[PDB]
Design a protein that fits this description.
Palm domain of DNA polymerase; alpha+beta; DNA-binding; 6 domains; transferase/dna; Nucleotidyltransferase, domain 5; binds 2'-deoxyadenosine 5'-triphosphate; eight-stranded antiparallel β-sheet; six-stranded mixed β-sheet; binds calcium ion; globular; 40% helix
Length: 901
Amino acid sequence: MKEFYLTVEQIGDSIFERYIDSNGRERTREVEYKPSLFAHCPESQATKYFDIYGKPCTRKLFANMRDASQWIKRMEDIGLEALGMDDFKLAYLSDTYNYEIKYDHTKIRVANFDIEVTSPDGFPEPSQAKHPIDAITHYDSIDDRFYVFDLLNSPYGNVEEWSIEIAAKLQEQGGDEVPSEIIDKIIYMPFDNEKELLMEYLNFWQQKTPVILTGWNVESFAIPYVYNRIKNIFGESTAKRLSPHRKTRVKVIENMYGSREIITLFGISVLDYIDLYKKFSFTNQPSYSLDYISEFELNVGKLKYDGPISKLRESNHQRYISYNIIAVYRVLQIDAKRQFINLSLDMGYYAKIQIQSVFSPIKTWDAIIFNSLKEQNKVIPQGRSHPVQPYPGAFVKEPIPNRYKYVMSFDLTSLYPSIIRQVNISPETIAGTFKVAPLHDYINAVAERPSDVYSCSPNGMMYYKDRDGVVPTEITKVFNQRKEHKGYMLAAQRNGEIIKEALHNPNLSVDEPLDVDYRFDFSDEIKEKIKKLSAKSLNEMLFRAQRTEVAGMTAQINRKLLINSLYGALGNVWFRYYDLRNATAITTFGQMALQWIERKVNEYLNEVCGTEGEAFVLYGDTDSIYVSADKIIDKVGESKFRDTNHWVDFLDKFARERMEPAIDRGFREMCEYMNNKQHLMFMDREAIAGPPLGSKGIGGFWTGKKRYALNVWDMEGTRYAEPKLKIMGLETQKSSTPKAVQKALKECIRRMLQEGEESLQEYFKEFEKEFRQLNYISIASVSSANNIAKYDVGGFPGPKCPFHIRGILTYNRAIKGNIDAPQVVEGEKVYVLPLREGNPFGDKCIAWPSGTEITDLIKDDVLHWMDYTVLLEKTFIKPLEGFTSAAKLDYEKKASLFDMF
DNA sequence: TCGTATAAGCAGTCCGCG
DNA sequence: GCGGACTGCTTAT
Ligand SMILES: Nc1ncnc2c1ncn2[C@H]1C[C@H](O)[C@@H](COP(=O)(O)OP(=O)(O)OP(=O)(O)O)O1
Ligand SMILES: [Ca+2]
Ligand SMILES: [Ca+2]
Ligand SMILES: [Ca+2]
Ligand SMILES: [Ca+2]
Ligand SMILES: [Ca+2]
Ligand SMILES: [Ca+2]
Ligand SMILES: [Ca+2]
């Protein structure tokens, strides 16, 4: 096999590299890597190294890395550019792995771990580590085993061994239902004392040293706790055995308001799954507890136990260990689904970076562009200091708030990256500027042509047309990878719909799901077989189709994230290629393109309908337009259509055969006007929306910018078995809105779009009547809680105190003196409830940590004093009134003359 | 919330608005 | 009570 790195570190003048050798063996080497850096040199001198602008460079080879660093400093003191890759370990990887890396994941040791710590006096601070570690479950991907380290004897209780037999049993037999598929994979090691537990853990760690280290909150909790606990018990040198090169750093993470400490373990790549989830999942969650996320991702039941977690070990050690094991498995189950580790390895090896650098697109892109340029003996510029400066972004059209019955939307593919490619926007392709007319003049094609030589953006920038810049070249590669995976995702989605249809008529028979690749559109043969399957097989196939879709989603959406972040990096001061001229060139062209095509689509439709000045485009945001199709439907007449799918097909065909060609012509003209290198403004039909044929549904509505709902029949070539609500921006989509309220509002919107006003009034009346029965958690609002101390004046609300922060202050007073009560963590989320006048809490709201039941001593009081009226008016009625007035509908039946009978 | 970007919505405080 | 000025938070893109 081809060799690949696992981890790389710089330690003084040595590179420490763990890698897989040609035989598949894990090795470690120390290399006295001599880095090269570059300086500009005279034109006369003959060399093979040039900077990105074609200026000649001389290579300076340093006796060691510290010399290179010292040189960079002296170059700053002199006031001269020190060119080249200043992160020497990236240069080492580039030198050592000068080919496309092909990695074998089966050879990479992925460790998933979780620890337990009993604590009476509240949260066990990792930096203190004052309490014993009494359980560690460590899953190893190479052995495929859960190693369980169990403390039998503690100052907080002596306990009996965990029993694998009870662990396996159903909860109905008094067991813990540890999943039967892992029971055989558990290696249980009980211990008489904490020191031997920890010593053995370290010896184990040494034998099976993680390359990738993950888990849930491992970076913020488990790793620092284990490290500091071993430190406190044995000394630093022993704690540093967690690093394979015996080097660690206490790393301070700085944010806006305060800071925390993590431990950097050299020669390990820590990918904390919470952090992976937050970056790559594209969710915003009310809580980030593992139970909550597991429930959301996997539909698994919450881990059940009585009493505080501080008493679970001594009261039920059996359950204590089993839940520790299960918590580790849950992260693996989430990864089997979401596949973020796979993604991180793909991105990391592609860029030739430390795998943990996938969190940073700036680092990812710096390394991709460096390797790309190195290939041509080109030399990257030095990073520079820049002041943070605002710059303009996308255009968003102000919609007329209204119902909109028939809507067809159109969307530009991967817009910002396409702009970069079309215009040829790169640090080294800048050709100069041209005198800019107001944007409106370009949109209406009355402005003078910017250039007859260069490719232009309406911000005034001109770019070379002779060759592609390194940014277009490298963004195109990842764009093309994204395209492949999105193709797989949509095929899986279309395949899902095929299964949902067949599920309407399941066969009464025993059979097995078809062995198929859901990444490809089902053939005719597969379609026939599906029509003959049982519901049990169809459901398993639907589950599998949907897992394939999710896998594709991860792969495609995060490649899209990476390429859109390359645009965003052009507007970040820490990026090597930071240039506000390039960032603005991109955003300004985007603005032009959307308004240009709006004008075009309007002109085209006014023509085919034989009108003038009619607004067919009702809305647009950044890269997408929404076309009112009412007139198109009316031109054939609703009565001519057999069913919903009939007009959906007709619109599909109108969009494909008539509008897209007009849209294409309009963008090709704009490409010529701007003299761009390559036409890449590809705008395709996205959504087809409208009410069910023969219903009183309104189809869709907008309330304002970034706030709308559509009843969608077809999305990007996926014809739904059942219409799908596409709701953007409205309270149903906000994590701050109560769960039960999101669900109720969503159903109000469903009724509006699919059934009409009367149906809506039916549902509202019932919800209003019954809502006081809803679980308090389901009707709690959610908010992040920043700067709690700032607004805390002697335990009371300071000036301008935010409503949710007031809740927390109320809560804090209610749990005063109690170090066992859950504390609200700064920067984390809270549930928030209003409180009726004259409650014992002494204020108008209370807040407690999200994902949790509120502590038992105040629960009854909260439940008794909860202000249901305020709750209803704020989270439900106000948003609903917003929706309905926008749509010219009433949620309550207005009195009429018929009330006389 | 360490980790690419801007546009823009709504809740809530504070206080004006004769 | 509603709006603007502003903070806080959260979406859409
Ligand atoms: N997370 C982000 N970071 C930076 N820029 C973004 C981000 N999301 C969107 N944008 C900008 C760049 C995008 O090209 C543009 C429109 O985005 P969006 O409608 O999500 O899809 P897209 O056109 O980028 O890809 P596609 O439509 O192919 O899925 O807005
Ligand atoms: Ca736990
Ligand atoms: Ca699209
Ligand atoms: Ca798009
Ligand atoms: Ca059938
Ligand atoms: Ca879009
Ligand atoms: Ca097309
Ligand atoms: Ca009480």
